[PDB]
Design an enzyme around this catalytic site. Structure first.
Site, short mmCIF file in Angstrom:
data_model
loop_
_atom_site.label_atom_id
_atom_site.label_comp_id
_atom_site.label_asym_id
_atom_site.label_seq_id
_atom_site.Cartn_x
_atom_site.Cartn_y
_atom_site.Cartn_z
CD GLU A 35 7.83 2.72 -12.16
OE1 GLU A 35 7.46 3.89 -11.43
OE2 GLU A 35 7.66 2.15 -12.47
CG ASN A 46 -0.94 5.75 -6.94
OD1 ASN A 46 -0.15 5.63 -6.37
ND2 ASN A 46 -0.42 6.71 -8.00
CG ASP A 48 -3.66 2.44 -4.39
OD1 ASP A 48 -2.79 3.71 -4.48
OD2 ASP A 48 -2.98 2.09 -4.79
CB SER A 50 0.04 2.93 -2.28
OG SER A 50 -0.62 3.29 -3.98
CG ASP A 52 3.68 4.71 -7.24
OD1 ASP A 52 3.31 3.75 -6.85
OD2 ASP A 52 2.95 5.22 -8.11
CG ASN A 59 2.39 1.28 -4.33
OD1 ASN A 59 2.18 2.41 -4.65
ND2 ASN A 59 2.38 0.12 -2.89
#
EC number: 3.2.1.17
Length: 129
Positions: A35, A46, A48, A50, A52, A59
């Site tokens: 990760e 991201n 989107d 969001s 992480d 997230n």
């Protein structure tokens, strides 16, 4: 902080991740490895909306509040910045919550992709736990 695998393993073990919900410590360490490359500061912002966060790249849509992610559920009830701490507790707690919220470790795509089906014990092999 960029952990070493064994150091992370030990930290995670202190936090009770070994065999948390049946996932051995190596899984957690592996997840962290893939990760975040053990980087507690890792962020992946991201497209989107969001992000992480942290060593387990948790997230911000469901798990932590970064204030800027649509659909925030903040199920870990933490600001996402807590997941960028050098100590892993918040990430661990949230990771536990992720699993407690009916996820396996498949919640972590890097685990699913890079740890699942692997010798995850390699990540704790040769360490002082």
């Amino acid at each position: 902080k960029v952990f070493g695998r064994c150091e992370l393993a030990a930290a995670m073990k202190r936090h009770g991740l070994d065999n948390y919900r049946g996932y051995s410590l190596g899984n957690w360490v592996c997840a962290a490895k893939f990760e975040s490359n053990f980087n507690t500061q890792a962020t992946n912002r991201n497209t989107d909306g969001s992000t992480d966060y942290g060593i387990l790249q948790i997230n911000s849509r469901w798990w932590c509040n970064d204030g800027r992610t649509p659909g925030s559920r903040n199920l870990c009830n933490i600001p996402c910045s807590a997941l960028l701490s050098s100590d892993i507790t918040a990430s661990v707690n949230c990771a536990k919550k992720i699993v407690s919220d009916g996820n396996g470790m498949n919640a972590w795509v890097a685990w699913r992709n890079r740890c699942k089906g692997t010798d995850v014990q390699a990540w704790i092999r040769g360490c002082r736990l």
